[PDB]
């Protein structure tokens, strides 16, 4: 009986592919290939944040564009005052294996997670003087890859046990479970309305979900390898995608298909982090070959090279005002350019 | 141009980084090892004098001049390519092989072939522990080892079978900067901490010689 259902699914996916093909008239070529080039972009080393004694695996910027959170394998979560190259807090972690970190938009909470399958939240503004654990969220059967804050009470985490979950910090329960993504969900990005988010996984799929619902609405496809990074456009209608096949793309929510792809012939290392500028014109992509090169989100052009990392870059971040970019590698030193 | 609050914030930062340096000095003298193997391959009883501290299991004990830490990495059913780079700076990888299970022997061989040629494990040495040798030698009369490993000749003795298994395990090694340490041990063998200590100090000496341009 499953043969008829499989045939119906094959007919539906053939119709979907035909619809994407027929909607792909006046395509990515010669629609954005009519404007001026971005030019030459060179960023000098303004800051070199030091203080970790292990590999930095994550980094998130504050919404004041003043404070950073870097969580590393040494069991330490240092909160950095970037304007003066300064340390504000140092939170000893119970489990040193960490693959993600978050910063609440209010500036009050930071999140952390890793191979302990626990998203542990921390409270910075306390009337005791030190950062304490506020709640330990457990219930996944796999490691957590990326956590992003919606407000002071709701967290959404992407984990490697083929699921994503939205929690509430007060009671520590999974309000919404986002089933799908047969591979391991490896990244997550929030649109600038706290309503819809994207999530890539190892099974080469970039689904789009809704927070107020519990199901997908657009399943982008087209990568031939693993995914590692994802990032929305400032409009809220597009997103980028970094992957293990040295291929960073731009996708389109309205068209339900794939816009221009910025890949290079000589590059073979995987992409670990992608990020967008304030206007969305400049895309910064991390690279596993000890480098982090910039591109253009409209045309294919290597506008510049940001070099200086002794090890692999695993976290890249652009502030809300877009004033500075943070680049963190496994050399225990993370850099801020201009 | 610095204010009073700025000065006291700089002092707080100095205290934070001094405590960070103290913690890094304290934690550098701990040997980190990565236990591996098949299901029920003797990982839970590698050392009978260990204290235990889910995603992964961490167990620690102290022997002579060094403090040991073991990562069982059990229950991590996810893809074994996304969190291996977390365990890239381990000094040694303890692989446990159970000679008793003939069905799961090829699973252990496949795992050994996977981990001994990974990009993150090109330099990390491996301390083999051919566990469960007593009942293996007890059952070596009925089973001649050719039911699971063909293309060999021998007297179906314990020594030759152990040598053949060890040779098959070392045949999956393709690296000029790594040495596999093999040590047959019993389930009643209390002498396991000294084997790991000798192997680990030999590994550290070998790594120091490698880094200086020597062997």
């Amino acid at each position, epitope marked *: 009986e499953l043969d008829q259902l499989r045939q119906e699914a094959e007919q539906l996916k053939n119709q979907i592919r035909d619809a994407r093909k027929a909607c792909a008239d006046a395509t990515l070529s010669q629609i954005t290939n009519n404007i001026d080039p971005v030019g030459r972009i060179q960023m000098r080393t303004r800051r070199t944040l030091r203080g970790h004694l292990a590999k930095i695996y994550a980094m998130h910027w504050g919404t004041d564009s003043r404070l950073l959170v870097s969580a590393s394998q040494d069991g330490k979560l240092i909160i950095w*005052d970037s304007y003066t190259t300064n340390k504000v807090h140092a939170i000893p972690l119970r489990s040193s294996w960490v693959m993600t970190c978050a910063y609440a938009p209010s500036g009050n909470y930071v999140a952390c997670g890793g191979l302990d399958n626990i998203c542990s939240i921390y409270n910075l503004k306390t009337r*005791e003087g*030190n950062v304490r654990v506020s709640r330990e969220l457990a219930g996944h059967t796999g490691y957590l890859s990326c956590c992003r804050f919606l407000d002071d009470n709701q967290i959404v985490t992407s984990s490697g046990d083929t699921t994503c979950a939205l929690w509430d910090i007060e009671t520590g329960q999974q309000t919404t479970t986002f089933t799908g993504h047969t591979g391991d969900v490896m990244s997550l990005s929030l649109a600038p309305d706290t309503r819809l988010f994207v999530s890539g996984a190892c099974d080469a799929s970039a689904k789009l979900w809704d927070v107020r619902e519990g199901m997908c609405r657009q399943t982008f496809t087209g990568h031939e390898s693993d995914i590692n990074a994802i990032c929305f456009f400032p409009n809220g209608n597009a997103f980028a995608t970094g992957s293990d096949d040295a291929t960073c793309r731009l996708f389109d929510l309205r068209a339900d298909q794939e816009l221009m792809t910025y890949s290079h012939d000589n590059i073979i290392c995987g992409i670990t982090s992608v990020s967008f500028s304030k206007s969305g014109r400049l895309l910064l992509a991390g690279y596993d070959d000890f480098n982090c090169n910039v591109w253009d989100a409209l045309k294919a052009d290597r506008a510049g090279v940001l070099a200086g990392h002794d090890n692999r870059v695993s976290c890249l971040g652009v502030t809300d005002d877009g004033m500075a970019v943070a680049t963190g590698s496994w050399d225990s030193f993370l850099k801020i350019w201009n | *141009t610095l*204010s009073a609050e*700025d000065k*006291a*914030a700089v*002092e*707080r930062s100095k205290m934070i980084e001094k405590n960070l340096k103290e913690d890094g000095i304290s934690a550098a003298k701990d040997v980190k090892l990565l236990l591996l193997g098949a299901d029920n391959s003797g990982k839970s009883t590698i050392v009978k004098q260990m204290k235990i501290i889910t995603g992964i299991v961490e167990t620690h004990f102290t022997f002579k001049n060094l403090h040991f830490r073991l990562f069982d990495v059990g229950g991590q059913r996810s893809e074994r390519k996304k969190w291996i780079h977390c365990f890239e700076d381990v000094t040694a990888i303890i692989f446990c092989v159970d000679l008793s299970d003939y069905n799961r022997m090829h699973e252990s061989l496949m795992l050994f072939d996977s981990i001994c040629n990974n990009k993150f494990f090109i330099d990390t040495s491996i301390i083999l522990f051919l566990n469960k040798k007593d009942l293996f030698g007890e059952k070596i009369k009925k089973s001649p080892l050719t039911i699971c490993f063909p293309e060999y000749t021998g007297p179906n003795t314990y020594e030759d079978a152990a040598a053949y298994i060890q040779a098959q395990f070392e045949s999956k090694n393709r690296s000029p900067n790594k040495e596999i340490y093999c040590h047959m041990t019993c389930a009643t063998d209390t002498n396991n901490a000294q084997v790991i200590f000798d192997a680990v100090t030999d590994i550290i000496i070998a790594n120091n010689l490698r880094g200086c341009g020597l062997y």
Partner: single-chain antibody
Amino acid sequence: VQLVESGGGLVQPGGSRKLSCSASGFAFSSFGMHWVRQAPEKGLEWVAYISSGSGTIYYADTVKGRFTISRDDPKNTLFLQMTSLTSEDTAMYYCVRSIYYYGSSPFDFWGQGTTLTVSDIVMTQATSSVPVIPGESVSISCRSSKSLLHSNGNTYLYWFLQRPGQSPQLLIYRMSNLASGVPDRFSGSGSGTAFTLTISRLEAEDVGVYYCMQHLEYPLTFGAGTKLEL
């Protein structure tokens, strides 16, 4: 979180006393604790200071060479050892906690004082007997000998409310930042050497004396005090 200060009492004009205060509820080593005295019918005055981990110890002009401050971090106790007690030291001695990082709120908790009996920047604020009506717009002013703005973009001026029979409580820090637990009616604004606390819709539990503080140059300067009547 509660600070209890013990000791004090009568002393001969030339003797010595060693006041001590203890904390129970917050991490002591992360806070730079202060000593602030209050004459029985006058304003507040800064006395002593010790940093986190005893890394910096500052004294006042009337405190240098005569007093000393120490803290016992393992036992969570702050010590004030005073020598050559004159008759001008007859004051109630307050223990004040303070933390310093980006976004901190220094001088956010005060301990109940110790009555002692022995038998720069200049700031002068407003009037001292203003007729507060319950429910109004009251603009308590302040002044300074300098424009208290640094290159960091932070203007430093603190507002304290002393209820009758109670220790001072922080209301506004930096220049316009509400402290935690302060209701939204309290609001402050100003510029260099011109500061005003605009209290709108005055209510109960607001009568008392209002104080300023500078925190650019470290020897602390208060104001005389503006008192809300009725």
